[PDB]
Design an enzyme around this catalytic site. Sequence first.
Site, short mmCIF file in Angstrom:
data_model
loop_
_atom_site.label_atom_id
_atom_site.label_comp_id
_atom_site.label_asym_id
_atom_site.label_seq_id
_atom_site.Cartn_x
_atom_site.Cartn_y
_atom_site.Cartn_z
N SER A 1 0.78 -1.10 0.01
CA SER A 1 0.18 -0.04 -0.05
C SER A 1 0.71 1.30 0.21
O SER A 1 1.64 1.46 -0.80
CB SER A 1 -0.83 -0.01 1.16
OG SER A 1 -2.08 0.85 1.02
N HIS B 1 -7.40 -5.70 -0.18
CA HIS B 1 -6.28 -4.82 -0.24
C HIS B 1 -4.92 -5.26 0.33
O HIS B 1 -3.80 -5.02 0.03
CB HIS B 1 -6.71 -3.37 0.47
CG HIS B 1 -5.79 -2.51 0.36
ND1 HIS B 1 -5.73 -1.78 -1.04
CD2 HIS B 1 -4.77 -1.81 1.03
CE1 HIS B 1 -4.64 -0.87 -0.80
NE2 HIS B 1 -4.33 -0.71 0.43
N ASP C 1 -9.92 -4.50 -5.64
CA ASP C 1 -9.09 -3.87 -4.45
C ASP C 1 -9.97 -2.60 -4.09
O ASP C 1 -10.13 -1.77 -4.95
CB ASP C 1 -7.60 -3.40 -4.92
CG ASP C 1 -6.91 -3.01 -3.72
OD1 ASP C 1 -7.44 -2.16 -3.00
OD2 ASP C 1 -5.71 -3.25 -3.48
#
Length: 270
Positions: free
Chosen positions: A95, A246, A217
């Site tokens: 991320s 995610h 996602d």
Amino acid sequence: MGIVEEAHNVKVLGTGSRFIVLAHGFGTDQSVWKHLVPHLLEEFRVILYDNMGAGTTNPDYFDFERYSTLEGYAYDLLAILQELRVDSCIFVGHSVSAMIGTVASISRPDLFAKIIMISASPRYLNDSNYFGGFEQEDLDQLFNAMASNYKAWCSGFAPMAIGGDMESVAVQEFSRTLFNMRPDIALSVLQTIFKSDMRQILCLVSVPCHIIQSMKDLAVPVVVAEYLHQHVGTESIVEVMSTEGHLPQLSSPDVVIPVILKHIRYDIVA
Ligand SMILES: CC1=C[C@@H](O)OC1=O
């Protein structure tokens, strides 16, 4: 332990010669890599660390000015790599950590043999010219919810970010790390992430990038993976996985771990 090592809960595992750095995303910690680490211990020396502001770190170290931009986190990563005396490493950023390592690699490309991005985005907000997935109203709503009942927000956000069955183990795990953050730090950090815009630095990247994401996602449309592929200033490759979530290295390790290992082992044609 050094002062930096301690502050970031740094761990160095395995018996290999080469370094690999695993950097976690918002709401979790280095435990997100738990399914991947056992497969790297023989080939590498695995560096795990926690981002300042994670629930595992001391909240008195969270300097709101320092971390108002992703650059602040990039300085922490460089400090860790220095204290540890890394010559070069393979960097796996999850991320936000994808962009944190990208920023760090523009200052010190010598330190990075390759960047592997998981669930990465250079910008979440939409533009008449770019689709990131969110309008400003989406954000305002998220932040009003977080500010009004953090515990309740964590319970509802965790199944959304993780995907799949809402009572799964991975959801429980992510729910718990989410609620271990001080609410005002969590609120600040997620705002910083959602408002960020890294598009302009992509063309300066000089380290090859492998861009991995779930096809479903909540925070990263599939077109963002193509966007990063097009705009990264060196060789790059995309792998969209047939997974939802995610944090796929946590919720679908049977599928996702082999993909990450493939991109660690193989290199992109210059
Ligand atoms: C885990 C994650 C949320 C996303 O927006 O960025 C991140 O770091």
